[PDB]
Each structure stands twice: as C-alpha cells, then as structure tokens.
A paper describes a structure:
Here, we report the identification of NADases on the surface of fungi such as the pathogen Aspergillus fumigatus and the saprophyte Neurospora crassa. The enzymes harbour a tuberculosis necrotizing toxin (TNT) domain and are predominately present in pathogenic species. Interestingly, N. crassa NADase (NcNADase) activity was not affected by either EGTA or Ca2+. Both AfNADase and NcNADase cleaved NAD+ and NADP+, but not their reduced counterparts, NADH and NADPH. The absence of ADP-ribosyl cyclase activity from the fungal NADase was further substantiated by its inability to convert the NAD+ analogue nicotinamide hypoxanthine dinucleotide (NHD+) to Nam and fluorescent N7-cyclic inosine diphosphoribose (N7-cIDPR), a reaction specifically observed for cyclases. These results demonstrate that fungal NADases are pure NAD glycohydrolases as they lack both cyclase and base-exchange activity.
To understand the catalytic mechanism of AfNADase and related NADases such as TNT, we attempted to solve the structure of the enzyme in complex with NAD+ by soaking the crystals with the dinucleotide. However, due to the fast conversion rate of NAD+ to Nam and ADPR, it was not possible to trap the substrate in the crystals. We therefore used the non-cleavable NAD+ analogue BAD, differing from NAD+ by the substitution of the nitrogen atom in the pyridine ring with a carbon atom. The structure of the complex clearly illustrates the binding mode of the substrate to the active site, and many of the residues are the same as those involved in product binding. The interaction with BAD includes two water molecules; one is found in the same position as water I in the structure of AfNADase bound to the products and the other, water II, makes contact with the proximal ribose. In the complex, F137 makes contact with the proximal ribose of BAD positioning the scissile bond into the active site. The benzamide (nicotinamide, by analogy) is also held in place by hydrogen bonding to R129, F130 and R148. The sidechain of Q194 makes contact with the 2” OH group of the proximal ribose. We propose a mechanism where water molecule I is hydrogen-bonded to the in-ring oxygen of the proximal ribose, the nicotinamide moiety, the phosphodiester backbone and R129. The nucleophilic attack is further prepared by Q129 which interacts with the 2” OH of the proximal ribose and can potentially induce a δ-negative charge. This mechanism would resemble a SN2 reaction with the formation of a transition state, in which the attack on the α-face on the C1’ position from water II coincides with the nicotinamide leaving and the formation of a partial oxocarbenium ion (oxonium intermediate).
Numbering used by the authors:
A (entry chain A): 26 to 234
B (entry chain B): 27 to 235
The structure:
Amino acid sequence: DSLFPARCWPDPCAGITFQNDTYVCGDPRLGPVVLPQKFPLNNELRTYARFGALCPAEFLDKWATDVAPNGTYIYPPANGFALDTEEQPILGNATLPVGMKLDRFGSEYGTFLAPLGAPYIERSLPPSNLNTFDGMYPYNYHVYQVTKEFVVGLGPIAPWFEQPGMGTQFVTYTNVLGLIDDGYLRRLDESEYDEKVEYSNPYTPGPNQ
Amino acid sequence: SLFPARCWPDPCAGITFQNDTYVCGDPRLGPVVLPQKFPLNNELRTYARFGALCPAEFLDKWATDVAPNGTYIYPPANGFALDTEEQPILGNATLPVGMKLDRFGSEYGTFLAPLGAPYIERSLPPSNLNTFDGMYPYNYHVYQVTKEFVVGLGPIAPWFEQPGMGTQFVTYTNVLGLIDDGYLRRLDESEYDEKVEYSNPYTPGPNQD
Ligand SMILES: NC(=O)c1cccc([C@@H]2O[C@H](COP(=O)(O)OP(=O)(O)OC[C@H]3O[C@@H](n4cnc5c(N)ncnc54)[C@H](O)[C@@H]3O)[C@@H](O)[C@H]2O)c1
Ligand SMILES: *[C@@H]1O[C@H](CO[C@@H]2O[C@@H](C)[C@@H](O)[C@@H](O)[C@@H]2O)[C@@H](O[C@@H]2O[C@H](CO)[C@@H](O)[C@H](O)[C@H]2NC(C)=O)[C@H](O)[C@H]1NC(C)=O
Ligand SMILES: *[C@@H]1O[C@H](CO[C@@H]2O[C@@H](C)[C@@H](O)[C@@H](O)[C@@H]2O)[C@@H](O[C@@H]2O[C@H](CO)[C@@H](O)[C@H](O)[C@H]2NC(C)=O)[C@H](O)[C@H]1NC(C)=O
Ligand SMILES: *[C@@H]1O[C@H](CO[C@@H]2O[C@@H](C)[C@@H](O)[C@@H](O)[C@@H]2O)[C@@H](O[C@@H]2O[C@H](CO)[C@@H](O)[C@H](O)[C@H]2NC(C)=O)[C@H](O)[C@H]1NC(C)=O
Ligand SMILES: *[C@@H]1O[C@H](CO[C@@H]2O[C@@H](C)[C@@H](O)[C@@H](O)[C@@H]2O)[C@@H](O[C@@H]2O[C@H](CO)[C@@H](O)[C@H](O)[C@H]2NC(C)=O)[C@H](O)[C@H]1NC(C)=O
Ligand SMILES: *[C@@H]1O[C@H](CO[C@@H]2O[C@@H](C)[C@@H](O)[C@@H](O)[C@@H]2O)[C@@H](O)[C@H](O)[C@H]1NC(C)=O
Ligand SMILES: *[C@@H]1O[C@H](CO)[C@@H](O)[C@H](O)[C@H]1NC(C)=O
Ligand SMILES: [Ca+2]
Ligand SMILES: [Ca+2]
Ligand code: NA
C-alpha cells in the first residue's frame, strides 16, 4: 500500500502547492490523508488507488484544468454515463422500488447516487469527494432508502479520474435533499447498513409470484 | 452469519441432502467454505447468500422446486435492468484495450462484470460460487482486453434476493472464443492482487487544447 505509487518518491508532492495539511500534499483536490478503516467504507475503498499509477501533479495535469490550486476537475460528458458505439449515453428512465438502498459520496444537493455498497472505483469520482464537510458524515458518505417510488435516469458509469467506473448511477431530477423533503428517500444511520443481510434485497418479487 | 438468525433452529428444513461440502448438502445453495483472501473476500463482504430467507424459502422463490430436481429461474431480457416501459437498458459498447473484466462461471458463458464488482451486484445464485476446476476456486476468472471488441453493456437487474445494479458485459462470443481469437487474455492472481491493478491507465484524459 502507501499514499503514492513507488515511482513518485522521494518527492511525491513536487509541483503541488501546499494549501492545508488535512489533504494529500496539502491539496484538497487530492483528497484526505486519512482514509476510512471501518465497514462498509473500507470495503468500498479496498480496490482504490487514489491516483492510479500516476503521481499527484500528473493526476491533476490529466484530470483538472491546472496543477496550480486554481485548477478544477474536468468531468466526463453526457453526465458521466458510459457511451455506446454511436457516442450516445447508455441509460433509461427507471422506477426505483420502495426498500431499495442507495448511497452517495457528496452533499445532499447532488443528483447522482449508486446502489448501496458500490466500490469507490465504480463511481468514477475524484479524490476530493472523500473530503469531510459535516462531521456527522465522515468522508461525505450518505446512505438512503427509497420510501416512495420515483423515476431516475439509470445506467452505467463511464470510466474517469484514472478509475474504471462501470458501476450503475442513478441520476435524479430532484436533488437528494428535495427527495428527502418530499418523502421519497429517508436517511439510514450506520446501524442500518452494518450487517450483510442489510445489503440483500427483500423487495424484488420472484418469478413464481 | 451463514443463515439468518430467524432460520434457527433447523435451517436446512425441507432440503434433501445430496452432496457434502455444499450448504445443506445442496449444490444449488453454494459451498460451505467461502473465499479467504483478496479480492474474492472483498467481493463477498456484503453477501448474505439467502438474504433474509431460509434455504427452502429461497429455493421456493427463485427455483422451480425445493426438491433436488428444481432449477434456478433466471431474470428476463438476459438480466438487464428494465426501464419504465419494461425494455432492457443497454447499448453496444467498445471495450478498450487494457480493461479488466471478471466472471464467476465457466468460459463457455458470456456474462462478465468490471473487475472487482461485488457478488451481490451480479444477481447470481449461490451455485455460481461452486468450484468446477481446482485451477479456478469458486469458478472465479479475471480477464484483460487485448483487442477491442463490442459487447452489450448495461445495468444488472435485481434477482436471487440481491440488489444487482452492477454493470454486465454480454459478449456475442463465449469467453473461450474471445480468448482464442485474441480479444481476451487470462490474468494470474498476481495481476490483480494490488490496488493499483484495479485502477485505469487506458482511458485518456479530456482534451484541453
Ligand atoms: N458470471 C458473472 O460474473 C456475471 C456477471 C454479470 C452478470 C451476470 C448475470 O449472469 C446471469 C446469467 O447466468 P448464466 O449462468 O446463464 O451465465 P453464463 O455462464 O455466462 O452462460 C450464458 C449462457 O450461455 C449458455 N451456456 C453457458 N454455459 C454453457 C455450457 N457449458 N454449455 C452449453 N451452453 C452453455 C447458456 O445459455 C447460458 O445461459 C445474467 O442474469 C446476468 O445478469 C453474471
Ligand atoms: C484546513 O481547512 C479547514 C477549513 O476548511 C473548510 O471547512 C471544511 C468543513 C470544508 O468545508 C472545507 O472544504 C473548507 O475549505 C480547517 O478546519 C478548521 O480547523 C480549525 C482548526 O484550528 C477548527 O477550529 C475549525 O472548526 C475548522 N473549520 C471548519 C469550518 O470545520 C482545517 O483546520 C485546515 N487544516 C489545517 C491543518 O489547518
Ligand atoms: C452429487 O452427487 C451425485 C451422486 O448422488 C449423491 O451421492 C451418492 C454417493 C449418494 O449419496 C446419493 O444419495 C447422492 O444424491 C453426483 O451424480 C453422479 O455423478 C457422476 C459423475 O458425473 C455420474 O457418473 C453418476 O451417474 C451421477 N449419479 C446420479 C445419481 O446422477 C453428482 O455429480 C454430485 N454433484 C456434485 C456437484 O458434486
Ligand atoms: C421434483 O421432485 C418433487 C419431490 O419429489 C419427492 O421428494 C423428493 C425429495 C424425493 O423423495 C422424490 O423421490 C419424491 O417423489 C416432485 O414432487 C411431488 O411431490 C408430491 C408431494 O405430495 C409427491 O406426492 C409426488 O409423488 C411427487 N410427484 C410425482 C412423483 O409426480 C416433483 O413432481 C418433481 N418434479 C416435477 C417436474 O414434477
Ligand atoms: C447491437 O448491435 C447488434 C448487431 O451487432 C452486430 O452483430 C453482433 C452479433 C456482433 O457481431 C456485433 O459486433 C455486430 O456489430 C444489434 O442486433 C440486431 O438488432 C436488430 C433489431 O433489434 C435485429 O433485427 C438484428 O437481427 C440484430 N442482429 C443480430 C445479429 O442479432 C443490436 O440491436 C444492437 N443493440 C443496441 C442496443 O443497439
Ligand atoms: C492558474 O494560476 C496560474 C498561476 O498560479 C501560480 O503559479 C503556479 C506555477 C503555482 O506556483 C501557483 O501556486 C501560483 O498561484 C496561472 O498561470 C494560470 O493562468 C491560472 N489559470 C487560470 C485559468 O487563470
Ligand atoms: C427521462 O425522463 C425525463 C423527464 O421526464 C426526460 O426529460 C428524458 O428525456 C427521459 N429520458 C429517457 C431516456 O427516456
Ligand atoms: Ca444493523
Ligand atoms: Ca500484482
Ligand atoms: Na522516483
């Protein structure tokens, strides 16, 4: 393991402007120095090489507008859905059933979720989505459960940010907070997603029903 | 917990013993011994193999019979998730050279997932963890694309008491054929035992010209 690929030593942070010691190389775009060590977060991050095989400045050079602190991450086209052979996004409008569990790295003003437990690398997220903004939600990780059916854009996640992607994303037409407001999602606390059976599916009916 | 606590005292009630080393002596219920090492143990960390059901309940719901002659019933539309009009969500997509895929199953089949996808994201029955070739414990195979080729690519519908919602790659030619024609190569476990080997070096960064 370790924070950087072995090639990056002895100066892995060369080219990075230090800003704040909470983050890798002092740069919030490179995510937090400290990573989760409890289930399920550690399970979702077990396959996560933060910069792939790149070093920090190469990673920022590739995926952001500038290695300097003013550089912003560039996001994939077509809302990050994987593209078919004709460059069109693969997705469909789909009804999320009551009982389905969803999770998300990001504030509740966002519109992108994944099925509960998807690996971080399946989400094609940059390292900064693991930064903590509310101490009640370390690593900006939120878990929800569908309390009333609603329709979302549903489809595969394109590779991005030096990761393979290919999770499924749910792109909502109301942001998360709005969906909670209107009774479509409820928040789950950690006791509701800390055992294996709580990842299983009781709501989908069988073929013989 | 192998069985949900609700199934005690006698979880194997209704199951006919057939073969030892399988849960309740029934190969449809998968092996007793589950994988002990990364990445397989990472892929099964969220797997409750019957959900909240007891073995006979699970077979009654998902197979044609609890008796040994029962066979698992599979989801329609080749297991793709369905949109609000009951059409499968998928597109034809080019898999790029370098992409890593994996699969629980034999090389005569056609369904793969992105390397590292959780077992519950694949909506597979317990018997896809059965070992048929000691060279491949749990029938777990990993591949890398060596020449680009087109697959059906889409979200995985929930089935078998699991949420699904990984992405599946549905090949037009079985795995063995694709290896033989030079589209896939087999990976040794040494080639997927480190986090960096799950990252993506082949997808290019956005154009900034
Ligand atoms: N296996 C995974 O890891 C996986 C990844 C992503 C998604 C999925 C999910 O798998 C589900 C399908 O399961 P199934 O066992 O049918 O897959 P697979 O093993 O690839 O087989 C495909 C078809 O090819 C035929 N055939 C396969 N072997 C032989 C053989 N030795 N001899 C003769 N014919 C054979 C047969 O029609 C079979 O149904 C589907 O619902 C899908 O959602 C799994
Ligand atoms: C690094 O900066 C943070 C402040 O960052 C802001 O607040 C975060 C919650 C998040 O919104 C970031 O994106 C923001 O840029 C410092 O956090 C403060 O730390 C002081 C410690 O003296 C503490 O008193 C305050 O409570 C913190 N402020 C907030 C708003 O939480 C942090 O200390 C900085 N790191 C270092 C090493 O100084
Ligand atoms: C599971 O076992 C069966 C054999 O039947 C079981 O074992 C007996 C010793 C006895 O205890 C029975 O009551 C059990 O039900 C295997 O089926 C045999 O397979 C071989 C090789 O393929 C074949 O030559 C025999 O004809 C088969 N016998 C029958 C009755 O079909 C079966 O292969 C085992 N399955 C697994 C996954 O191990
Ligand atoms: C598939 O098998 C079931 C169950 O078979 C019985 O139980 C097994 C464990 C073993 O002991 C078999 O030899 C048994 O016949 C069949 O279910 C029927 O179960 C009823 C229950 O009242 C019993 O009366 C019958 O005799 C069985 N039916 C027959 C013999 O026609 C089931 O029929 C089998 N599969 C199909 C497609 O019918
Ligand atoms: C995806 O493309 C297939 C056809 O792709 C060709 O055939 C495959 C077997 C494989 O060799 C590919 O590399 C080829 O490019 C479409 O299948 C056709 O669909 C139409 C209408 O749905 C049907 O009438 C044709 O007979 C199908 N062809 C075959 C050979 O079955 C498929 O529709 C495409 N899927 C999407 C979502 O665009
Ligand atoms: C972004 O900022 C660049 C200059 O940043 C400064 O120089 C670099 C080398 C670092 O030392 C950094 O800490 C400094 O703040 C500009 O050259 C560039 O044009 C700016 N980008 C935009 C889009 O304006
Ligand atoms: C999904 O629904 C939204 C809102 O109703 C609509 O704007 C969009 O075109 C639909 N997309 C598909 C693929 O049906
Ligand atoms: Ca719990
Ligand atoms: Ca290795
Ligand atoms: Na070096």
